[PDB]
Design an enzyme around this catalytic site. Structure first.
Site, PDB file in Angstrom:
ATOM      1  N   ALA A 171       0.832  -1.200   0.000  1.00  0.00           N
ATOM      2  CA  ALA A 171       0.000   0.000   0.000  1.00  0.00           C
ATOM      3  C   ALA A 171       0.869   1.253   0.000  1.00  0.00           C
ATOM      4  CB  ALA A 171      -0.939  -0.003   1.204  1.00  0.00           C
ATOM      5  N   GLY A 172       2.078   1.118  -0.522  1.00  0.00           N
ATOM      6  CA  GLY A 172       3.027   2.219  -0.500  1.00  0.00           C
ATOM      7  C   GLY A 172       2.674   3.287  -1.510  1.00  0.00           C
ATOM      8  N   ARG A 173       3.682   4.011  -1.972  1.00  0.00           N
ATOM      9  CA  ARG A 173       3.424   5.076  -2.920  1.00  0.00           C
ATOM     10  C   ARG A 173       2.788   4.509  -4.186  1.00  0.00           C
ATOM     11  NH1 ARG A 173       8.124   6.264  -0.335  1.00  0.00           N
ATOM     12  NH2 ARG A 173       9.495   5.340  -1.943  1.00  0.00           N
ATOM     13  N   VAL A 174       3.459   3.563  -4.828  1.00  0.00           N
ATOM     14  CA  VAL A 174       2.989   3.051  -6.115  1.00  0.00           C
ATOM     15  C   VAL A 174       1.731   2.203  -5.974  1.00  0.00           C
ATOM     16  CG1 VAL A 174       3.567   1.711  -8.166  1.00  0.00           C
ATOM     17  CG2 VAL A 174       5.305   3.163  -7.089  1.00  0.00           C
ATOM     18  N   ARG A 180      16.598   1.616  -0.450  1.00  0.00           N
ATOM     19  CA  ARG A 180      17.972   1.367  -0.013  1.00  0.00           C
ATOM     20  C   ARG A 180      18.290   1.972   1.356  1.00  0.00           C
ATOM     21  NH1 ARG A 180      20.648   2.150  -5.956  1.00  0.00           N
ATOM     22  NH2 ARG A 180      20.658   4.441  -5.982  1.00  0.00           N
ATOM     23  N   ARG A 197      22.585  -2.769  -5.407  1.00  0.00           N
ATOM     24  CA  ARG A 197      21.548  -3.450  -6.168  1.00  0.00           C
ATOM     25  C   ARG A 197      21.420  -4.909  -5.719  1.00  0.00           C
ATOM     26  NH1 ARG A 197      24.137  -4.869 -12.038  1.00  0.00           N
ATOM     27  NH2 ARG A 197      26.078  -5.773 -11.204  1.00  0.00           N
ATOM     28  N   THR A 244       7.437  -4.758  -8.230  1.00  0.00           N
ATOM     29  CA  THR A 244       8.635  -4.637  -7.409  1.00  0.00           C
ATOM     30  C   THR A 244       9.924  -4.766  -8.209  1.00  0.00           C
ATOM     31  OG1 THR A 244       7.377  -5.872  -5.764  1.00  0.00           O
ATOM     32  CG2 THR A 244       9.705  -5.443  -5.305  1.00  0.00           C
ATOM     33  N   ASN A 245      10.847  -3.828  -8.001  1.00  0.00           N
ATOM     34  CA  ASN A 245      12.131  -3.855  -8.706  1.00  0.00           C
ATOM     35  C   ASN A 245      13.182  -4.724  -8.005  1.00  0.00           C
ATOM     36  OD1 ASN A 245      12.186  -2.605 -11.268  1.00  0.00           O
ATOM     37  ND2 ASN A 245      12.068  -0.562 -10.336  1.00  0.00           N
ATOM     38  N   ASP A 303       8.228   2.352 -19.640  1.00  0.00           N
ATOM     39  CA  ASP A 303       9.338   2.840 -20.467  1.00  0.00           C
ATOM     40  C   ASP A 303       8.803   3.407 -21.764  1.00  0.00           C
ATOM     41  OD1 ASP A 303      11.476   1.846 -18.678  1.00  0.00           O
ATOM     42  OD2 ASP A 303      10.829  -0.137 -19.395  1.00  0.00           O
ATOM     43  N   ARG A 334       7.157   6.906 -21.440  1.00  0.00           N
ATOM     44  CA  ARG A 334       8.252   7.848 -21.437  1.00  0.00           C
ATOM     45  C   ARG A 334       8.753   8.062 -22.869  1.00  0.00           C
ATOM     46  NH1 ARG A 334       9.295   6.967 -15.336  1.00  0.00           N
ATOM     47  NH2 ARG A 334      10.239   4.891 -15.185  1.00  0.00           N
ATOM     48  N   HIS A 357      13.645  -4.053 -18.364  1.00  0.00           N
ATOM     49  CA  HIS A 357      13.259  -2.794 -17.725  1.00  0.00           C
ATOM     50  C   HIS A 357      14.464  -2.314 -16.922  1.00  0.00           C
ATOM     51  CE1 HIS A 357      10.825   0.322 -15.958  1.00  0.00           C
ATOM     52  NE2 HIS A 357      10.946  -0.159 -14.724  1.00  0.00           N
TER      53      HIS A 357
HETATM   54  N1  LIG Z   1       8.334  -1.908 -12.407  1.00  0.00           N
HETATM   55  C1  LIG Z   1       8.251  -0.488 -12.463  1.00  0.00           C
HETATM   56  O1  LIG Z   1       8.380   0.091 -13.516  1.00  0.00           O
HETATM   57  C2  LIG Z   1       8.349   0.295 -11.207  1.00  0.00           C
HETATM   58  C3  LIG Z   1       8.222   1.691 -11.176  1.00  0.00           C
HETATM   59  C4  LIG Z   1       8.355   2.320  -9.935  1.00  0.00           C
HETATM   60  C5  LIG Z   1       8.624   1.612  -8.756  1.00  0.00           C
HETATM   61  N2  LIG Z   1       8.774   0.254  -8.817  1.00  0.00           N
HETATM   62  C6  LIG Z   1       9.127  -0.483  -7.587  1.00  0.00           C
HETATM   63  O2  LIG Z   1       8.044  -0.847  -6.802  1.00  0.00           O
HETATM   64  C7  LIG Z   1       8.494  -1.081  -5.505  1.00  0.00           C
HETATM   65  C8  LIG Z   1       7.720  -0.209  -4.581  1.00  0.00           C
HETATM   66  O3  LIG Z   1       7.649   1.134  -4.934  1.00  0.00           O
HETATM   67  P1  LIG Z   1       7.122   2.226  -3.943  1.00  0.00           P
HETATM   68  O4  LIG Z   1       7.643   3.597  -4.314  1.00  0.00           O
HETATM   69  O5  LIG Z   1       5.616   2.226  -3.883  1.00  0.00           O
HETATM   70  O6  LIG Z   1       7.711   1.793  -2.545  1.00  0.00           O
HETATM   71  P2  LIG Z   1       7.051   2.138  -1.138  1.00  0.00           P
HETATM   72  O7  LIG Z   1       6.380   3.497  -1.160  1.00  0.00           O
HETATM   73  O8  LIG Z   1       8.147   2.010  -0.129  1.00  0.00           O
HETATM   74  O9  LIG Z   1       5.954   1.059  -0.799  1.00  0.00           O
HETATM   75  C9  LIG Z   1       6.329  -0.292  -0.535  1.00  0.00           C
HETATM   76  C10 LIG Z   1       5.438  -1.018   0.459  1.00  0.00           C
HETATM   77  O10 LIG Z   1       5.777  -2.366   0.555  1.00  0.00           O
HETATM   78  C11 LIG Z   1       5.920  -2.695   1.908  1.00  0.00           C
HETATM   79  N3  LIG Z   1       6.496  -3.950   2.327  1.00  0.00           N
HETATM   80  C12 LIG Z   1       7.805  -4.124   2.661  1.00  0.00           C
HETATM   81  N4  LIG Z   1       8.075  -5.410   2.947  1.00  0.00           N
HETATM   82  C13 LIG Z   1       6.904  -6.077   2.784  1.00  0.00           C
HETATM   83  C14 LIG Z   1       5.895  -5.171   2.395  1.00  0.00           C
HETATM   84  N5  LIG Z   1       4.636  -5.650   2.163  1.00  0.00           N
HETATM   85  C15 LIG Z   1       4.356  -6.992   2.301  1.00  0.00           C
HETATM   86  N6  LIG Z   1       5.323  -7.847   2.679  1.00  0.00           N
HETATM   87  C16 LIG Z   1       5.325  -9.154   2.862  1.00  0.00           C
HETATM   88  C17 LIG Z   1       6.588  -9.548   3.219  1.00  0.00           C
HETATM   89  N7  LIG Z   1       7.396  -8.456   3.247  1.00  0.00           N
HETATM   90  C18 LIG Z   1       6.586  -7.418   2.908  1.00  0.00           C
HETATM   91  C19 LIG Z   1       5.940  -1.456   2.723  1.00  0.00           C
HETATM   92  O11 LIG Z   1       5.223  -1.547   3.895  1.00  0.00           O
HETATM   93  C20 LIG Z   1       5.467  -0.399   1.827  1.00  0.00           C
HETATM   94  O12 LIG Z   1       4.235   0.049   2.204  1.00  0.00           O
HETATM   95  C21 LIG Z   1       9.952  -0.737  -5.482  1.00  0.00           C
HETATM   96  O13 LIG Z   1      10.726  -1.878  -5.699  1.00  0.00           O
HETATM   97  C22 LIG Z   1      10.059   0.152  -6.652  1.00  0.00           C
HETATM   98  O14 LIG Z   1      11.313   0.179  -7.246  1.00  0.00           O
HETATM   99  C23 LIG Z   1       8.624  -0.386 -10.012  1.00  0.00           C
END
Ligand SMILES: NC(=O)c1ccc[n+]([C@@H]2O[C@H](COP(=O)([O-])OP(=O)([O-])OC[C@H]3O[C@@H](n4cnc5c4nc[n+]4cc[nH]c54)[C@H](O)[C@@H]3O)[C@@H](O)[C@H]2O)c1
Ligand SMILES: NC(=O)c1ccc[n+]([C@@H]2O[C@H](COP(=O)([O-])OP(=O)([O-])OC[C@H]3O[C@@H](n4cnc5c4nc[n+]4cc[nH]c54)[C@H](O)[C@@H]3O)[C@@H](O)[C@H]2O)c1
Lengths: 294, 294
Positions: free
Chosen positions: B8-11, B81, B87, B118-119, B147, B150, B172
């Site tokens: 439920a993070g940013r993305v 990070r 990485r 997830t990356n 991509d 963009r 990607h």
């Molecule tokens: N593929 C693409 O093009 C692309 C583009 C942009 C970004 N990404 C990628 O997407 C991922 C997330 O991107 P993001 O900015 O939204 O990241 P965020 O805001 O930190 O939110 C993360 C949440 O996960 C949570 N959390 C952590 N551990 C667990 C968990 N949830 C469940 N479990 C179960 C076991 N362990 C966990 C934590 O609690 C938090 O709320 C990153 O790898 C980005 O690079 C990919």
């Protein structure tokens, strides 16, 4: 159609995103004291746009000239706390920011309508209207719309269906109240429970998620829509009152009509009991303005 | 139509928001290791929903059972990070998270399609498909779509109009490439400039704004749409290859067809030069998998 945002923060950028998803926007301008943020938000938003095959000119920066032409400008700019700060301390800090912005907007987009969002919203919208030469039709605030959405949500949760019109008016704050009289929908509820759930959902969301973001974003969108699409919708809006309902020299939430020319009080008939409550909120709001020199 | 989000993070929340704005969604489920966040996002999203007169069941929490029924599940869960991390260190950390999730999803929504975000996306989607019993049609990744968006943006910036089809495929990541052959649009460009602007826009946005959010959110939406609306669209997708283009035992970006049954390689004719580049990305990706025990 150009859109202006002063403040590229959480609410600023997300509400703009929303507009991008749902409006025929030609240009989007993002101005923020933090330049790289405004810029970075402008880039991200464009990458988004291409995914629905939209290609408006989206520019972000720290220079207010970017706003020239904006049919309307959403102002979300402001501060948070240091949770050892105080509502008053913040009101002063933000009042300064709003004053400074009002000038800037007037000397760059002197003809644009202005949507005030920065909290305490009713007070900030008033300070915006005062600090810019502008008429009371070109300056107004987002608030009750958001409160209303929350209202409708608790209503549907309480069994109600076909909910056309359920409104909250007054101070966007503790002093708010439901306009029971204007409420229309199938099903029986419990205004006790509901009206109360509503006063601190905001706070419950802030506790858990960090901030209120998506709710506010949509409400801002619906208000922008109504104007940029001259829809003539009526939306609870923080309006500068100058006689209406017996209230003077303050901004407070009331049913307003939105369209190309901005907002104007709908002058809908309110209960006797509800004009009381409206006068309550205005007193509270008026005092909080005095504490600030307005 | 039920939607699942793990993370439920940013993305996660923003992409769900997007779906809410643009899809006929009945239920939305948000699962995150941080409960109050999942919950707080679920509340905010509902307040938003009411503003476009939508009232789906939106639930957020830390228990994976919330996912039962999800026609599809967007997995954004993972880490950042300590900019003194690496990485590789992260790939291990996140690989653990993806494994753990794969199980959970299988024993709660065993029949749902899975969108991996997830990356490092191509690697995580592979680990997801391996760690869950699932067929290669029910597990795939969001990447090239973003991509591509963009890409289209830099193309329109370079004068190009009527841009149907401009795609990026492959990893990607650094190893990505434009599919020049499939590109169709009016106007002449400069694939030099463009293809290069694209490899690190992501980074330029992260530098300024903090993270890539809105771009990714829309791309995720377009992929969810395509599936939940059985649109049969072709979208560059990180697919598990098992023969196609001469590539085996890895996930990498390729034109795929999306619909109710998930994704399947479109098998579009690629340049000779472009199947080289595709094989490049697969080698790189394959090595990065080995470093992890896959
Ligand atoms: N593929 C693409 O093009 C692309 C583009 C942009 C970004 N990404 C990628 O997407 C991922 C997330 O991107 P993001 O900015 O939204 O990241 P965020 O805001 O930190 O939110 C993360 C949440 O996960 C949570 N959390 C952590 N551990 C667990 C968990 N949830 C469940 N479990 C179960 C076991 N362990 C966990 C934590 O609690 C938090 O709320 C990153 O790898 C980005 O690079 C990919
Ligand atoms: N009315 C409603 O119902 C409602 C609902 C929810 C929230 N709100 C309110 O909206 C405001 C913002 O809400 P928010 O969560 O988006 O807040 P944020 O994420 O911190 O982003 C703030 C940005 O402003 C920036 N900034 C600071 N100072 C200036 C500035 N920009 C220009 N100038 C010029 C001179 N000074 C400044 C700073 O750089 C940052 O990028 C808060 O008061 C909320 O309570 C209202």
């Amino acid at each position: 159609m150009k859109l202006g945002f002063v403040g590229a923060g959480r609410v600023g950028s997300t509400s703009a995103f929303t507009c991008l998803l749902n409006l025929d926007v030609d240009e989007i301008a993002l101005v923020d004291i933090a330049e790289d943020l405004a810029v970075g938000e402008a880039m991200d938003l464009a990458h988004a746009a291409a995914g629905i095959d939209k290609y408006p000119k989206i520019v972000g920066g720290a220079d207010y000239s970017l706003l020239k032409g904006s049919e309307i400008i959403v102002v979300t700019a402001g501060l948070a706390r240091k949770p050892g700060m105080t509502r008053l301390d913040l009101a002063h800090k933000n009042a300064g920011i709003i004053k400074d912005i009002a000038k800037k907007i007037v000397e760059n987009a002197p003809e644009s309508k202005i949507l005030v969002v920065t909290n305490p919203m009713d007070v900030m919208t008033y300070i915006m209207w005062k600090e810019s030469g502008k008429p009371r039709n070109e300056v107004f605030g987002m608030g009750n719309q958001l409160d209303s959405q929350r209202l409708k949500e608790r209503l549907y949760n309480a069994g109600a269906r076909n909910i056309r019109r359920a409104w909250i008016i007054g101070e966007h704050g503790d002093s708010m109240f439901v306009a029971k009289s204007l409420a229309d929908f199938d099903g029986e509820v419990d205004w006790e429970a509901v009206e109360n759930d509503v006063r601190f959902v905001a706070a419950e969301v802030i506790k858990r998620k960090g901030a209120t973001i998506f709710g506010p974003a949509v409400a801002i969108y619906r208000m922008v829509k109504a104007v940029v699409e001259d829809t003539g919708e009526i939306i609870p809006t923080s309006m500068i009152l100058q006689g209406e309902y017996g209230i003077e020299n303050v901004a407070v939430g009331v049913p307003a009509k939105l369209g190309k020319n901005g907002a104007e009080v709908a002058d809908i008939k309110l209960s006797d009991e509800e004009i009381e409550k409206l006068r309550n909120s205005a007193k509270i709001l008026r005092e909080r303005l005095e504490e600030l020199g307005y």
